[model samples]
Structures are given as structure tokens and as C-alpha cells.
Target: ASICTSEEWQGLMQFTLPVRLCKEIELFHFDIGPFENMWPGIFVYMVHRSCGTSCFELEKLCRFIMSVKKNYRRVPYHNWKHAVTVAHCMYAILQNNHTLFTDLERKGLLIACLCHDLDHRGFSNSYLQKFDHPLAALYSTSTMEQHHFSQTVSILQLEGHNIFSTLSSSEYEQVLEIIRKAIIATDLALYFGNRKQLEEMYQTGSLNLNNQSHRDRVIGLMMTACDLCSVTKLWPVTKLTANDIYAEFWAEGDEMKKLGIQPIPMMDRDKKDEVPQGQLGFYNAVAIPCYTTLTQILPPTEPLLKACRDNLSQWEKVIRG
Candidate 1:
């Protein structure tokens, strides 16, 4: 219910994009979602107030989303819009029945999640590393997530042009730390690096979900859950997000072709190898196990968990070649 309109958001920009895409720009460009969507990345500040958390993080996050959207275009995946969605889903997931993070710490988590992927080029970690581009060079010394973190901050500090102007120095630093941890966890190649971090809180022969106090832990799982939430969302939205992922895969394929690099699985078209139900099968093999383990650890998300499983079965019947 909380809205995070940018200070400079305007209705006119909606028409600037392609006509078909423009039809739904307002829903996405501003807090008023165009697609029957009212996702709030806003952190709930108090239990009593209708839409609480008068934190600066929320306002800046709205601004950051606008900054990335207005600043860049034509890149396929890992865009600002997706970053916003990740943060929104993360916020919703953090609606714990009890206070998990301090109010100040939550602000950091919210800002970190919101701006972690600014100025993404739809390139995977491996792709970006090979290019020797500024992002790669600047973060060349860093690991994949480390590079992503540094580049994300660089976009905010250099190109972002004060999108985070409201906060003091310390608050800004705190926000940086929170975002750094969350974004780094998104490096899929690292495998168990993040899992071990989250599962370390084992207590009484069971991992203690109660210790959601560590802001890093909260953001880590939230980021994981958010990225995979597609399978758990309403089918239409899930379908749309999947389509977007394919679009990204296609665009990346185009670039690879021009550069004479091999296309990733979905991006390849020279052979009869279709994406295998748009690679819903890929998620079935991968995402199902991850979500299954998560739902087992935390039972409340059984509905969402089940949705992921059901989505696999339904997509199977729908995407036969």
C-alpha cells in the first residue's frame, strides 16, 4: 500500500518507450503498477500505522529505481526494473511475525536490495568478466559478487548523480554494506558459499529460523527467495517474468553472435534444441529442489512452495514441442 514515487517521476516518459510497452509503463515506472500489481518494497516501520516505516531508505529506493530506469535502456536482463522487483519481493518476504532486524538495520537492508544491480548489461558474471570492460577492469580484482557490488556502488556513486542524496555519510555506508552482502549472494556459480552462510545458525538439531536478526541472513535468503519467487507467483506474472528472461537470453545471444561467442543454452537457435519448455524444465530440475528445501526449513510458505511445484507440472503440459 505504501507508494514510493520518485521526486522526478512524470507521466510523459511513459510514452517515450515503444507504444506497446508504453501502454503499461505507468504500472512499472511509478509505484502505481500498471499490471494489476501493487507490490510495495516499502519496509513496514510500525505494526500500528497503516503503511509505516518513514525511513529514508524507502524514498531513496524509489528514487534509485527511477534513476536506473531513466538512465539506461536497451540492456536486456539484470536491469533496474528487475532489481526493483527483487527488492519488492524481498521486502514482502521480510514481513516476519516478529521483529527480525532493528529499524535502522532494516533501512540498510531495504536500500541494499533495491539498488544492488544498477546499470546491468544483461551479461552474466562470466560474460562480463571476459570483456575487459570498465566494469570488469574496475572489479577485476574482485570475485563475481564482489565485482557486482563494486560496480553497483560505482553506478550509484558516479552515474547515479546523488539519487541517494538524502542520507548522511554513515547511513550511506551502512546501506552499502547491506546491499553488498545481498548482491554478492546472487552469484550462482559460488554454489554452497551462500547456503553454508545461512545454514550456519543450526540450533537444537534444527537451523534456527528465529535468529533472523542478522541482517545479512535476512537479506541473503530474501534475495534467494525473491529471485526464485517467479515459480511461486500467480501464473500470469510468472509467465511474464519467464518471457522477460527469454527476451534477455535472446538479446544476449544477439551480442554473442556479433562477437563470435557461443550462445548459452536458451539463446542458441541454430539447432533444433529449443529451450525445453522454455527451460521451465531447467527450473524444475534446479529451482524445485531449492524451494523444496527452503519450504521444509520454513513451513509457512507451503502455499508458495506448492505453487512452485504445481507450476512445474502445468508448464510441462503447456510447453510440449
Candidate 2:
């Protein structure tokens, strides 16, 4: 039980985001999360405020929060910085929307967003599975996502790390199930099927944002949406993240080359200049499709949709330039 209080954290690291700095995050229209180190603490604060951490053991929760941060390896894009940004996007979404989801679903969304990419090894699922990686052998499908969700459960099982410790066993089980579905929803391939479900609902006029089953499907889509937050950030912000992701991709490709393997076009280091075109293709095909359906169904997410359009235009110019 390594939970600690705000004062204790201050004593240990002598840092917490100042009130004004937090407020400034809002000034960006929540376009940005706090600086890197402040991200976990900021997310922990958001969780407590939204999901009600009042009864959760403070020391355990605090230590668990810190532990989650400690686990993200220092890679290019999918590091702690990206995790907090996704969680911050989750926070923003829940704050503004009135989806049919319960407080439980909303809380699970936030937790899943933060833990979705935990301990990522900066390798693709296919790469891992191809190399006989243990995670691939374990799941045989949705490999990385299953690993991420399992990591979340593992952390919670640790002494003093279960933020949901206040709940009864039944409630804990329910939340765990929600977290599992939410994290798996972050897998991009699954997004196609997930999007089809939501789009069919919207088209057939059968969608009910308040219906539990309908709500569960949409909440899963929302997790995927928030995971792509950078896709909808302003130009520089989007490009900044794009560079980091490509840097990670290229690194993997470079490593593969040394093993006498040929990486796919997007991941190939020799094709570095193709990033703008590749991003354009991805933004149009994946990001726009998901967010368009989301905005059509939930107008409160217009900011994300709008920013995505803006970035698409920028990508076009880059390709033409």
C-alpha cells in the first residue's frame, strides 16, 4: 500500500502542477495536456475529480498512479506523454458529453485511455507475433492491446495499487470487464468493425446513446477516438506527434533491416519522406471515418472532427509542396 497524499508527493518530488498551469490546459481548449512529468499527477487528479477517488486509499492510489507512469518506456510516441494526452482527451470528452454511459463506463474510459499503451515495446503487433514474441503466443490476436489491459489488471492486483479497492468484489469485476473491452477497442483493426456497428446504428435510426448495449459499443468507439487525439490537434501539434510516431516506426524498420528483413512502406526508414503522404492516407481513411461518425452521433465532439479536417488540409499541402 504505497498510496500517499498530495502533501507527501510534494515532500517527495516537491512538485504538483500549479493551479494556473492546469487552468491553462483548459485555455488550449484542452488541445494539450500538461508537460511530461506532470501528466500522471494531472491524470490522477482528473480521475479523482471525475470518478470519485475519495474512498480509495490515498497512498495506494498515488503510488499506483506513479507506478503506471514509471512503466512506460522512453520511446518516441507511445510513451507516458502520449498516455496522458489520451487520458486528458478522455477527460475532455466525458466533461462535455452526456452519453448514455454510466459513471462506471466513463471512469473505465479514463482508466483504459491511460493504460491502453502501458509498457509498449515500440513494436507493432505483427512484428511481435512474427518474431514469436510471448504476448503474440499468449493471445494469437489483438496481441498488444491484450498485453496492455493485462498490465492494468496486474498493477491493480499489486499491494496498495488498486485504485478500485473501495469497490465490492462484484463492482471490481464489472469495472475490470469494462476496462478490458475499452482497451481492446484501441486496436486499429478492430476500429473498422466497431465503426461499422456504430454507423449502422446511426443509419438505421436504431442508435440510442442511452441504451446500455448501444452505449457500450459507442464507449468503445470513444476510446479509439481519444487514442487518436493527436490526429485532431492543430497543425504543429499533429505534426509533432506524427514525427514521433514515424521516428518510432523508422527505428523498428532500421532494426528489421539489420536482421535482413524488409519493413512495409510506411515503416521503412528509406521512405522517410513519405510520412506526409502516409499520414494523409491514414487521416482520411481512419481518423476522418471514425470522428465523422462520432460527430454525427455526438455533436459535442465537433472540436475533434473539426481539427481532423484542418489537419487533413495541412497534410494535402505537404504532399503537394
Candidate 3:
């Protein structure tokens, strides 16, 4: 119903993904650059394999995903491509720990990843608030995240776009709640609070997955880890991701300069030479701790922490030279 041609439908349904690529996708080291053009099909394949056909109708799933894709603005970093990569990371995490989460929770997390940055405007939440943007006023905090979740809800409300249509009312409510919390958890501010709580639980040896509160906290941490999963990729892929992220940040800085405001050092294009140092600082302060805490709770996620350390050293090398 969303204007797909027969050929396009066939391509989505019957995309030829190599066995090696599938295997790589299940590993955290996978690179999405070479397969960028195949993202739509790859995303479909990930959903189909992870959620299975019984959960939702194929046509409705396609429509929902396509609608989600269209909702993303063409920003330098937070676009449809980024969403696909995040969703792929979630897919890999889910695959590695298949029995850890319920089927409905897995589906919720994947959909949340795919829709997390919907309608991003190429600017950070701080920039929005600084500019007194309407969205900033709409939500006192987590401005972009709130908009992203709202956009996701909008897509679901569209006719033929609700992949959860087959779910009973209770199940639908539970999944929607999961989606909302997961999307909001991507805000680094909330992540810091969630991480501290999770770390405390780990330290006290009270981190039981059987408890719903404990489980939600872990899920929040996983969402942050997946959102920042680019840092866990191989060096080349991680470097490319960082470049795009800075490009968007610098663009926001340029806008701020037009208003006679000095952007923060991280966003200041004039401080371009300091990027490597900035990357190193970010890894030490945020990325490493995030994945480290995650690895502690979920041993299967150790590879992500290892890769983050590897990329941290790579950034160090960049700073040295």
C-alpha cells in the first residue's frame, strides 16, 4: 500500500545475502559501509530472522519499516542508514543472547532501535534548547528522543503501518511501553543514571534478570550500548562513524556562530585538530565505561568492550601523530 513496485517487493522478499555477510552480521565486527545500498533488504532479513514470520504479516512489516525509513531526515549521522546500523547491532546482540530476552521484548528493542532517531534535525538536544526550538519547549529534557518516539507512534498509527496489529491489546501495550522506554534510554543523560543504577546492582550482587526492575535496567543499558555501538566496530568503520558524527556537530556549531554564540570545543570546527583527542576523551569517559558495565552484566557482550578498547588505542595513535 506504500507504493512498492513488483520488482521492489521481490527485491525485499528475495534479497540474496551471502552466507558470510549473514555470519558477519551476527558478529559485532561487521562493517555496514560496503553493504550500504543493500540496507533495506538486509534490514528486512534481520527482522525476518529475528522476529520470525509468525509475529507479524510480511506486507505490514515491510510497510512499517519503509515508513520508519521515510521518517528519518537526511542528516549526516542520524539518518536511515544509522538507524539500520543500530538495528543490525541490536539484531546481533539478540542473536548472541537469544534466550536472555522474551520474544516480544526482542521485537520491541529492534523496533525501538530502528525508530530511535526518527526525524532527527542534524542537531543535538543542547542546540535545540539553545535555539529555543519548538521541540525543546515540547519536552523539558530528552527533546529529540521524545520527538523520535512520537514519530514512531505516528508511523504506527498510519493505516497498514502497524506491524504489531496482530498482537493482543495487552501485548500491544507492553511492546509500546518497551519501545518508548528504549527510545528514551538512548539519551546519554538518562543512560548515565541508568548505568549508575545498574553498576550499583552489579556491585551488590543483586542484578537478577528474573526481577522485572533489574531486567528493565539491563535493557536500558543494552539500548545505550547499541546506540553507541559504532565505537565497538573495527577501527576504519569506527573512524568513519566518528567523522560523520563530528560533521553533524560542526554543522550545528556553524549555526550557533551565526547567532554570535561560541560552540563547545567538541562542536567547534576551528578546533578540528583536536578531534582525535576529543575521541580519546569520549572513549575514556563514556564509551569504555558503558561497554565495560554491559560486559560485566552480560558476558556475551565482552567482544563489544574489547572492540571499544581497540578503537580507543586507534584514536590514541591518531592523536600521537
Candidate 4:
């Protein structure tokens, strides 16, 4: 990415694009739900059986997840679609490399990936904590990750939302443990790309893989890598992936503006031009580092890293023309 400035690159991005633009990006998620919901009752059951209470908005969660059938369609750039993308990418890694994960763990990985962001309203832990929303109270900043995991556990408490109600108590408990850790691991704050996975490897070194026992540890580490695998994609693929993420985020910001909520960070358009450098800084810092490390793990990432490097130049071209 040989760029002079974001002004030149702004045109490289579009708000909400129609489907069919990025097939490689779409491969990372699994969508099947009520015609209205793509996750299907299978996932709902998988979760409910693991959890004993469906505490929060089950219907709304399902509808929202279902409504955005394309992981390419969510807002704030990182919404359900992003979650699904990570899940799909995780599934690919598991399938391709002959990983030690079992069928149940694989399913757990998919569930964790799909349901991780079930109802996030585009605000990070910091933004939510400051605003005094109900979730803010339920989840203090310290335990935002824990709260997210707990929500995964809590929702399935009821037989309806509980995806695994059919599973025996013991079976349900086992799978719940796997899914919970997987969900908790989605926070980019947890592992800066894959560099921070060592703590997890040390902590779960003796986990049980034979019966999905090691899932708690194994999947947590894998989950972080999976979410960050955007760099693992090819260069053209990287552009599509980043744009897919950003488009959803922008939509969430648009919704916030309408709802009277402060648009939460990057989504806040008033403080930003259609293309803002604050975002460029964050993307350059957080996303670039994440993608750069990915190149080390998967060499194709280098071109994408270079492509991001070119963002400034490309946007400048758009600006001048």
C-alpha cells in the first residue's frame, strides 16, 4: 500500500455494498437460521442446552443475526458478519491443517465464532461503560469479557434459546465450557494478533483433547488467531475483508446517530469526515500490526500488509482525481 494520505484512499471504501462483491470474504461464515435468521435452530439449541437460562433478548438476537444474513452486511464494520467471518476462517483452519480438535470442539468453535457478538451494539467496553446502559452495569469494564462469556452461558439457560437442551446435563456442561472460552477469546484486546497466545498455551497446556476436554484451552488460543486471520487472506482478499469489516461499523454508527446515542468511537460521523484520520490511525496501529503479524504466520499476509501500506497512496489518487 504505497499511499500519500487517507484523502487519496477514502474512495477505496464504500458504506454498505451489495452481496456478490467478495466471495473469498464470504467463505468464512456459516449462515442458516429461520428464513429470517441464518444461524438456524441448531445453534440456538447448542447454546440453550449448554446454558440453563435464556436471560436476555433471545428473539431479538436471533432476528438480528438472521436479518444480517451476509456477515458482509453488519454495521460498525465489526458486527455479526465479522463474527461469522472469523468462525468460517476458524473452521477452515481446523479443517485444512489436520488440527487435533474433535467434532464437538469444531462445532464449539463454530458456535463460539457465530454467537460471540450476538448482540453487541457497536460500542467497545470503554464506550459502553461510560454511557450507563443496562449492559454497562451488568458488565463493569474489568469483566467485560467475562460478561460476554456469561451472556453466552446465560442466554441458553432457558429451554427455548438453549441450543443444547437435548444434550444430557453432563454433555451440555462439557460443550458449554468449550463454547464459553471460545467466545471470551474474540476480544482483540486479549491477544494482539497471535503474539499473546503464549499465556493461553501455558495455562491450558494439559487440557484434554481426547473428549473435547482440552477445548477450553485449545479453542481460546485458536479463536484469537482465527479472528485475526484476515491477513492470512490474499491481497485482493484483504481489501475486501477490511472493507467488509468497516462497512458494518459505519452502519452501526448511522443507527446510533438516529437513536440519539453517541455514535461510539469510529462510528461517530459528526466528529469525523466521511473519511477520518482518527480511524486511519487506529487501523494503521491496531489492524496493521495484527495483519503484519499474520504475514509472519502466513506469508501471503505480506502483500496485504503492503496493500494496507498503499492505502494512503490509493486514497490520495481518489482525492486528486
What clash count goes with each model?
3, 5, 0, 43
Model 3 score (lDDT):
0.87
Instruction: Kindly list the per-residue Cα lDDT of model 1 for residues 49-68, writing each as its tens digit.
Output: 21243443443434444454
Candidate 1: how many backbone clashes?
A: 3
What would the per-residue lDDT of candidate 2 be over residues 1-321, giving only the tens digit for each residue?
123344544432334567876665542146554365566567767776666756456666566767777678899989988888888887877877734456777777788888899889999998988889888889889999999998898888876677787888988889898999989988887989889998999999999866777877888788888889888887888888888998899988988898899998888978977888888889888999988998888788888888889999999998887
Scored by CA lDDT, what does every candidate get?
Answer: 0.53, 0.80, 0.87, 0.51
Ranking by lDDT: 3, 2, 1, 4
- Per-residue lDDT tens digits of candidate 4, residues 50-71? 3322622454435323432322
| Candidate order, TM-score descending | 3, 2, 1, 4
What are the per-residue Cα lDDT tens digits for candidate 3 across 164-252? 88899999999999999999999998988899999999999988999998888889989989999999998888988988999999999
Clashing pairs in 3: none
Report lDDT (Cα) of residue 260, candidate 1: 86
Alpha-carbon runs more than 4 Å astray in model 1: 1-33, 36-53, 57-65, 141-148, 151-173, 196-218, 270-273, 277-281, 319-321
TM-score of each: 0.70, 0.91, 0.96, 0.55
Query: Candidate 3 regions off by >4 Å?
Result: 1-10
Which candidate achieves the best TM-score against the true structure? 3
Task: Give the C-alpha miss distance for residue 135 in model 3, angstroms.
Answer: 0.6
Q: Model 3 — TM-score against the truth?
A: 0.96
